[PDB]
Structures are given as structure tokens and as C-alpha cells.
Design an enzyme around this catalytic site. Structure first.
Site, PDB file in Angstrom:
ATOM      1  N   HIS A 139       0.830  -1.218   0.000  1.00  0.00           N
ATOM      2  CA  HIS A 139       0.000   0.000   0.000  1.00  0.00           C
ATOM      3  C   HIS A 139       0.859   1.260   0.000  1.00  0.00           C
ATOM      4  O   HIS A 139       0.266   2.337  -0.081  1.00  0.00           O
ATOM      5  CB  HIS A 139      -1.124  -0.065   1.036  1.00  0.00           C
ATOM      6  N   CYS A 191       3.535   1.941   9.284  1.00  0.00           N
ATOM      7  CA  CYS A 191       3.390   0.763   8.441  1.00  0.00           C
ATOM      8  C   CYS A 191       4.763   0.301   7.962  1.00  0.00           C
ATOM      9  O   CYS A 191       5.644   1.118   7.779  1.00  0.00           O
ATOM     10  CB  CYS A 191       2.469   1.010   7.263  1.00  0.00           C
ATOM     11  N   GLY A 203       2.389   6.422   9.445  1.00  0.00           N
ATOM     12  CA  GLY A 203       3.823   6.337   9.150  1.00  0.00           C
ATOM     13  C   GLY A 203       4.465   5.085   9.727  1.00  0.00           C
ATOM     14  O   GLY A 203       5.628   4.814   9.346  1.00  0.00           O
TER      15      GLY A 203
END
Ligand SMILES: CC(C)N(C)c1ncnc2c1cnn2C
Ligand SMILES: CC(C)N(C)c1ncnc2c1cnn2C
Ligand SMILES: CC(C)N(C)c1ncnc2c1cnn2C
Ligand SMILES: CC(C)N(C)c1ncnc2c1cnn2C
Lengths: 304, 304
Positions: free
Chosen positions: A41, A145, A143
Site C-alpha cells: 500500500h 506501516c 507512518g
């Protein structure tokens, strides 16, 4: 003495964290050998996340669109591929700090350490469990991830988790390092609700053994039980069924303490039925389920 | 979202841990520049610890009696001195992994990370607070002495604790890195009992702010209070008195949430008087006091 929720030392993993940016999205990657692993993503806008077609979105991306920074030094991306829900960015430099490592897919009830990172930089370390509903209860801001979960066996890091998603109920979902989600979750901003967050019975028992070892003994009683009788009570309290395999795993703690596993189950049964009556066990007012039997033996024996 | 008991990433400290052996005693040292810091009780037998004369015991020790090993490599000891309750072993090699660092003496209620080590090797990391009675509630087995507590500010490690002693009640005592014990404790195996382990009120309030930020809000009520009224209740429950300085420190969390500090004090007052009624806050059944206001802001803002 004393018993703490303890994470693995993070240094070996700190040496693997990088920043990955694609367009306006920045998150974390894991740099092992000449591959950087990150959530697919990274290629999405928040708008994209409502209904992303990752294969279609990825066609518009080239190697030079993936900005990979290791501290203040840029890595050259020489290839990229999608595996399940992760991207593998091939870089022209092997990470010189790559530890011995494995990728493992853990089972519900297994614990691991998370190195929470932002912009490729470590912020903190904490101990998680894979919940029975395949969520984790982490601490992850925008942030974070691509932050990873791991165990260490002496000098080998077993990576088991990469952070992808927060559900609307504020619990977390992610993948193994092959990019396969734990549980039914998907990397789309949609209605995904977690199932029952049952208590990991074998871990509670382990922690009660840790309590006895460390001098907290008030909950020990004069009773015993059977797996079937205990499980009738477990089920009523949304505890995982205890199996003979769990009993076998608790054998070393039983041996160390001289408290039969089924006697500890009878202690636990009384605690479920009667509550804590305002008392604490190892500084907790609830029954702690994020220590595995292995965790308890490790911490009680001082393994490095 | 989510709020976890989070330690600092440990890598910078892992790079400083060494093994120190004197005769039959092995524990941990901290290697910074060309000095290794360790508990002076490395020179004691268990027999010695009943009534040690450290100056006398140290006369029988030479540089070559202190065996310092950094991984599998021996360091050459070229000098030794006693400062308060630590030894400083001067070695002929500066630690090449020495981070930017400071030695700080913390106040009761301040939190820090501990890197628990055995034989110079890191076993785990966890978050501690300096208790109001100047004990810490750690996880320390035989061999863990010389393990350190620290905070990190970006790239600077502030070392605040070195582990020396377990009391008979299973709580822990130690020193700053100048070798001065926190509180009244001594490095002798004697009757030392801890005073009242009061609750760090300002930290509880910080954690209630963390709860609201992370969507746990059920305990918010329609009441307010005054510092004096709150403190009458705090004192009854063995909470530390709340000062205007504490109120000032909570100002940023008050601003972020729009909940006046004294309104949160009134929430806390009701929780003390009424209990949790079987409910939880951020996954706890008790009021958590090992997050400082700074910890809450740091974790809620994603500082690296
Ligand atoms: C990511 C998953 C599929 N991996 C590779 C694994 N998961 C669980 N047990 C494993 C492995 C590899 N070896 N062993 C014993
Ligand atoms: C007391 C017995 C009859 N019960 C219901 C159970 N015992 C052990 N494992 C179980 C169950 C139910 N589901 N699973 C996986
Ligand atoms: C071990 C103790 C005495 N040290 C040196 C300190 N303790 C508290 N605040 C400090 C320092 C040094 N600078 N500052 C601002
Ligand atoms: C309600 C007022 C009169 N009380 C007793 C207090 N208020 C604030 N700080 C205090 C106390 C007692 N000790 N200390 C350090």
C-alpha cells in the site's frame, strides 16, 4: 526475581530499518541482503485505499519511483515485485548489518517484539501477541506501516509480522514477511471487523507459573480439575480451549514449581469465577495472556 | 492508535555491554570510551556481601584480576578505581560503538528502559519507573547486576541506572552511573526494607490522557476538583501529592484533548473511590503509573 513484559533487544532489527517513499506516501521497509520489504500500500493514496487494484496501480510505478533511504544514504532500486501484500524492492547493495534471519508465520497465541518505526527510524520496542482473532494490539501511528515483529533465537532473527492496517476499533492487522495477512484482513479501507478476542489460556497458565516462581502465590487453592471441566468454564469466559498439547508444553513449569498443570487450571478456574477481589498478580489486576510458556522459561532462566 | 508500555530501542546500549569477572563473580559492565563501569560488588563473594569493606577487598585486586570480555574478545585493563558504589575499569581500547551519552540522576516518577543482560549479553528490554521509595520493579536474575537503565533523546543515550541489589521483597535497588544509590539502599546483604510504594499521580493522569486520545473515554465524568480536594483523596489512596508543577507539565495533553487537568483529576478521584467496576483502561484493570507526561506525548506523536 521480578517478571516484566520484556521485548527482545532490538539492535539487530534497528540495523535493517529503512524509509520507503512512493509519491506522497512514506512508510518503513525492512532491508535484508539486497531486498527491501514493505507494504504494497506504499503505492496508494488514502483515496486509492478505498478500493485499490494493486496490480493496476503498480503498472504506473518504476524502480526510480521507490525512494529507499537507509539513514541519510539513498539506496538504488534495481528491481521491484509484488508478493501477496508486500513489495520486494531489489537494491544494488546488500545490507551490511543483515543478521542471520528467517521468515516465520506464527500461530495465534504466539508473542513477538515490535520495533515501531517512523520514516525508517526506530521509536520504541514492545511485546505483542498474535490474538486468537489474528489481530494484534499494537501502538502504531500514521507512518508506522512496515514496522516489523520478530523473535530472536540467540543470533537468528525470526521475522513474523509486518504492520499494514488499523481497523476502525483501533486494533492492528498485518502480514508475515511473505506478504500473507494474518487472519481474514485485507489492505483496503473497508468494513473489516475483528471476531471475538478470546484469552490465550495456555499463556495465562504460564504467567500464573511465573507468578508462583516470583513469590505471588495467594491464588493457589486446594482444588484440581480436568481438561473437560476446566474447558466448560474457559468457554463461558471466552478463553481458548486447553488441549493436552498445551498441558505438555506447560510440563517444564509444572516440574520446576511442583504444581500439576490441572491444579493450576483449578486456580485459574477460581480466579475466573471469583475475580481478583482487588488483589494483583505480578502487578496486574487482570489475567495476563501475552507471555508464552517459552517466554516464562526464557525470562525465568535468563537466556541471552 | 493503541498505547503500549514501550522501551527505547536498545541497539545503542547493546553495543556497550561487556562481561566483567572478578574471581568467581561474573556480571555486566558498561563500556563507554575507554572505561568500563560495573558494580563494585563484583569483587565480593556472597559471603563478603554480608558485611563488605570494599576499600579493604579492593586492595587485594589488581588490573589483571578484572576480566573484561566484549563479545568473544578480551579487553586489556590498564587501570581501576572505585567511585561510590561503581568500579571504573580503564581499558586500552575505546569502545568503537560508544554512542553520544550523558550520565543523569533521575527523580522518582521518571521512567526509563532497562536492557537486562547476563554475561555481557542482552536478554531483553523493558520499561521501568524510579518508584517514589527509590526502588524499581525490574526483572533481574543472578548475573544481571551491571545491567543499565537509560533514556534516549534522538541520538544521545542518558544512562540513569545500574542494577546492584535485590531486596528480600523482590524489588530492586541500584545506582546512577556515578555509583550513588537511589534512595537509602546499600550494596550489603542486610535488612533493607522499602518504604511505601506510592502511586505516581502525574503519570496516572498522563496515562488517562493517553486513554482519551486512544478512544478509552468511559471514565470521563461531569465533575471537577481542586488540587487541595484531590490531594485529600490522593493521600488516602497512597498517591503522591499533585503540585502545580505537575499541572503545568500536563498542559500540552490538556490542550490536545480539551480536558482541563482538574477535570481529569476529578475523573481519577472517582476511579479511586469507585474502582474500575470490572472495566479496563488501555487494557489495564489498574491505574498505570509508569508513563510520564513526556512518554505519553512522545508515543502519541511518534518521536524517533
Ligand atoms: C512465512 C512462512 C510460510 N514460513 C516460511 C514458515 N512458517 C512457519 N514455519 C516455518 C517457515 C519456514 N520454516 N519453518 C519451519
Ligand atoms: C468440554 C468439551 C466437550 N468442549 C466443548 C471442548 N473441549 C475441547 N476443545 C473444544 C471444545 C469445543 N471446541 N473445541 C475446540
Ligand atoms: C549523575 C548526575 C549527578 N548527573 C551528572 C546529572 N544529574 C542530573 N542532571 C544533570 C546531570 C548532568 N547534567 N545535568 C543537567
Ligand atoms: C491538602 C493539603 C493540605 N496537603 C496535606 C498537601 N498538599 C500538597 N502537598 C503536600 C500535602 C502534604 N504533604 N505534601 C507534600
Amino acid at each position: 526475581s521480578g517478571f516484566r513484559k520484556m521485548a527482545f533487544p532490538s539492535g539487530k532489527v534497528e540495523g535493517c530499518m529503512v524509509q520507503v517513499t512512493c509519491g506522497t506516501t512514506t512508510l518503513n521497509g525492512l532491508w535484508l541482503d539486497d531486498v527491501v520489504y514493505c507494504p504494497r500500500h506504499v503505492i496508494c493514496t488514502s483515496e486509492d485505499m478505498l478500493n485499490p487494484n494493486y496490480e493496476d496501480l503498480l503498472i504506473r510505478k518504476s524502480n526510480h519511483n521507490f525512494l529507499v533511504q537507509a539513514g541519510n544514504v539513498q539506496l538504488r532500486v534495481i528491481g521491484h515485485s509484488m508478493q501477496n501484500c508486500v513489495l520486494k524492492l531489489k537494491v544494488d547493495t546488500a545490507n551490511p548489518k543483515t543478521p542471520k534471519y528467517k521468515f516465520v508465520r506464527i500461530q495465534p497465541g504466539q508473542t513477538f517484539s515490535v520495533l515501531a518505526c517512523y520514516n525508517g527510524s526506530p521509536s520504541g520496542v514492545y511485546q505483542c501477541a498474535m490474538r486468537p482473532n489474528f489481530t494484534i494490539k499494537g501502538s502504531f501511528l500514521n507512518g508506522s506501516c512496515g514496522s516489523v515483529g520478530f523473535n530472536i533465537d540467540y543470533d537468528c532473527v525470526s521475522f513474523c509480522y509486518m504492520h499494514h492496517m488499523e481497523l476502525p476499533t483501533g486494533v492492528h492487522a498485518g502480514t508475515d514477511l511473505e506478504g500473507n495477512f494474518y487472519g481474514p484482513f485485507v489492505d483496503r479501507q473497508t468494513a473489516q471487523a475483528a471476531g471475538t478476542d478470546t484469552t490465550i489460556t495456555v499463556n495465562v497458565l504460564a504467567w500464573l507459573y511465573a507468578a508462583v516462581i516470583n513469590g505471588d502465590r495467594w491464588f493457589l487453592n486446594r482444588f484440581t480439575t480436568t481438561l473437560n471441566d476446566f474447558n466448560l468454564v474457559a468457554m463461558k469466559y471466552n478463553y481458548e480451549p486447553l488441549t493436552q498439547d498445551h498441558v505438555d508444553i506447560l510440563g517444564p513449569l509444572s516440574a520446576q514449581t511442583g504444581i500439576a498443570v490441572l491444579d493450576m487450571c483449578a486456580s485459574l478456574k477460581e480466579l475466573l469465577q471469583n475475580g481478583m477481589n482487588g488483589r494483583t498478580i505480578l502487578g496486574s489486576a487482570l489475567l495476563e495472556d501475552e507471555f508464552t510458556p517459552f517466554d516464562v522459561v526464557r525470562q525465568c532462566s535468563g537466556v541471552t
